[PDB]
Amino acid sequence: MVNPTVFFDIAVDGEPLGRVSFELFADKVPKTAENFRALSTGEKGFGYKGSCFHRIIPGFMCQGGDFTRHNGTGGKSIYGEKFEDENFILKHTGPGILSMANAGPNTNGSQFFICTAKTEWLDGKHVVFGKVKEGMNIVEAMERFGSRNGKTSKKITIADCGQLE
């Protein structure tokens, strides 16, 4: 199977910023990739469209995916409230890595993070499932609205999202 590609159209306080696209490594983690892909298209009736990045820490990562509570307490997977860590084949190699947020072993929902650095200390605890293809400069622009404690100075939103192929 060819690895799927998804896009996010990012807005700052409602104003278009740019497009970010991701390669999803379905050849390593098909269950995790599929979940992100489906929440990106909205085909299940719910997903990332209109959600925000509630937690951005400069030099570290941008966290999003909480489309039910918008603060880190919510979100759900296409498989149910949670699913297992599929595997840890892939590592946090550097900027652009797309990886699952969680609340301990086997608690994957819909929350994810895009790294803006190598985050090796997270290897084996967070399932890496993708990487930024185009629009790393958009991610870098998003990053600048974050702070040390994660709070954003402006509303960073996924105005639109879906699948390219």
Partner: peptide
Amino acid sequence: XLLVXAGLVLA
């Protein structure tokens, strides 16, 4: 510290 958690954010 620098974690990416969902609910109880730790140091």
